[PDB]
């Protein structure tokens, strides 16, 4: 079978977890919510 | 696209083999800036690159993921900071 | 004259067998000291080379020429590749036969005409009956699935080397379709174009009654048409 999907699952499951603790850096440290 | 092309002939393990070898690069970069925040590339020959941060340059494949890993390189170099 | 007529057969043509597009292979006939005993042997043996040569011209200009993708099938596509492949692999016993003879007349180069003949009789009958079946297919500019009923059609003989030797064929061109056909119902989407398969919801597909195979049912076909569309929308 042709595909690069085999490829994609171990990378988009790590772009998620990149922007959770992107989001929670913002939260808890900078207080945007306080904003 | 000369994979999906041809895949039901002989020479099928032929074009496997040559793209296998081939995308190697392309899967070694985009190993780096996601996990790493450090880009790499050859000759400028792949188009992505790279306050307030986003004041930073840009200029098949799967294009669902390949702008998604755009800013998924840039947040790993801010958190680096 | 006896190695002379090997190397001619087997597709390179010499001055004895002046190589025609209209005669095929035929003897020089011209000879002050030729025999008529061996004239009607020699010329019913050259029908069998001017079939070879046919055949592979026509499987070499046909296969491969292309990194697989016109929009007619008579010339082009995945079929017809495949129709060239299964010809190739039902020639093999005659190139077999070719080099058991080559071996005979090393050992002993005082053998009869009617040897060879005698063992070239089974293919005398093969060549001509599988002939028409390539021949129309150029001549109609058979296209798609159309293809997979010419053989089966002829696949009815009463003759048991030609039943098997077109269902060789028939086999060889059905290992593509069903390497389509395994990835449109598990997904919706093909990677063949130009060559319909009553595939052209029906989101930009449509069905196709005279494409369909004549053993293939349309309830078969609906159902293949079923279970592609319902996984391509969940």
């Known amino acids: 079978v042709l595909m690069k999907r085999s490829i994609t699952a171990p990378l988009a499951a790590h772009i998620s977890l990149v922007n959770k603790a992107a989001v929670d850096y913002f939260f808890v440290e900078l207080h945007l919510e306080a904003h | ?81 | 004259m006896i190695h002379e007529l090997l190397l001619a057969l087997s597709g390179y043509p010499g001055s004895i067998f002046t190589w025609n597009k209209r005669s095929g292979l035929q003897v020089s006939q011209d000879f002050p000291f030729l025999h008529p005993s061996e004239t009607s042997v020699l010329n019913r043996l050259c029908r069998l080379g001017t079939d070879y040569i046919r055949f592979t011209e026509f499987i070499e200009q046909y296969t491969g020429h292309v990194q697989q993708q016109q929009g007619q099938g008579g010339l082009h596509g995945i079929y017809l590749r495949a129709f060239c492949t299964g010809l190739d692999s039902v020639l093999q016993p005659y190139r077999q036969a070719l080099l058991d003879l080559e071996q005979e007349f090393l050992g002993d180069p005082h053998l009869s005409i009617s040897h060879v003949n005698y063992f070239l009789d089974q293919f005398q009958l093969l060549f001509p009956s599988v002939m028409v079946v390539v021949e129309q297919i150029k001549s109609q500019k058979i296209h798609g699935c159309q293809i997979l009923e010419t053989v089966y059609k002829h696949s009815c003989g009463g003759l048991p080397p030609v039943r098997s030797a077109l269902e060789k064929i028939l086999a060889v061109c059905h290992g593509v379709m069903y390497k389509q056909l395994s990835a449109w119902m598990l997904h919706g989407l093909l990677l063949d174009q130009h060559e319909e398969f009553f595939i052209k919801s029906l989101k930009q597909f449509s069905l196709r009654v005279e494409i369909l195979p004549s053993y293939i049912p349309v309830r078969v076909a609906e159902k293949i048409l079923f279970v592609g569309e319902s996984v391509q929308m969940f």
Not at chain 2, 47 to 58: A, E, N, P, R, S
């Open chain 2, 1 to 81: 696209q000369e994979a999906l092309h041809n895949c039901s002939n002989e020479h099928y393990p032929v074009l496997l083999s040559l793209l296998k070898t081939s995308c190697e690069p392309y899967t070694r970069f985009i190993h780096d800036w996601v996990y790493s925040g450090v880009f790499r590339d050859a000759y400028g020959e792949f188009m992505i690159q790279v306050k307030l941060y986003w004041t930073h340059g840009y200029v098949v494949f799967l294009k669902h993921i390949a702008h998604d890993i755009y800013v998924c390189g840039k947040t790993i170099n801010l958190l680096k900071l």
